[PDB]
């Protein structure tokens, strides 16, 4: 998968209280992958070591590849407004040279 790139979107140090260890820490990583040609996916990997959470999330996301339709290879086909849970996103189709003017995660 040399044509695919992986980017990190969040690294969290959550805690699970245990009788043996008290507060126990794991690394929860959210990553996204894409080949820059319409195919992309995301996954979450959890482990006790950060390096392991990177491997788990990176190889899991390659199994959930969406294909996204791009108008003329540079933009969305039409405006998109949606609510996912309590997060609202309002995307707009723009002409060439407009660039990405979006949340930093959306730019990634």
Residues that bind another protein (CB under 8 A): 92-98
73 φ/ψ sector (left φ>0, alpha ψ -120 to 50, else beta): left
Nearer to another protein, 21 or 69 (CB): 69
Two tokens, residue 51: 């390096």
Phi, psi of 98 (to 5 degrees): -75, -30
Alpha carbons 50 and 11: distance in angstroms, whole number:
9
Minimal distance, residue 10 CB to another protein, in Å? 32
Minimal distance, residue 94 CB to another protein, in Å? 6
Nearer to another protein, 36 or 97 (CB): 97
Minimal distance, residue 95 CB to another protein, in Å? 4
Nearer to another protein, 22 or 97 (CB): 97
Q: Cα 71 to chain center, whole Å?
A: 22
């Amino acid at each position: 998968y040399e044509d695919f790139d992986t980017r990190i979107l969040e690294v969290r140090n959550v805690f699970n209280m245990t009788a043996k260890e008290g507060r126990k820490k794991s690394v929860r990583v959210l990553v996204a992958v894409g080949n820059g040609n319409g195919a992309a996916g995301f996954a979450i990997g959890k482990a006790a070591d950060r390096g392991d959470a990177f491997r788990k999330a990176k190889n899991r996301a390659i199994h959930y590849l969406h294909y996204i339709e791009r108008y003329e290879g540079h933009t969305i086909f039409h405006d998109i407004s949606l609510r996912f849970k309590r997060t609202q996103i309002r995307m707009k189709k723009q002409p060439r040279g407009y660039g990405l003017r979006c949340h930093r995660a959306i730019i990634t």
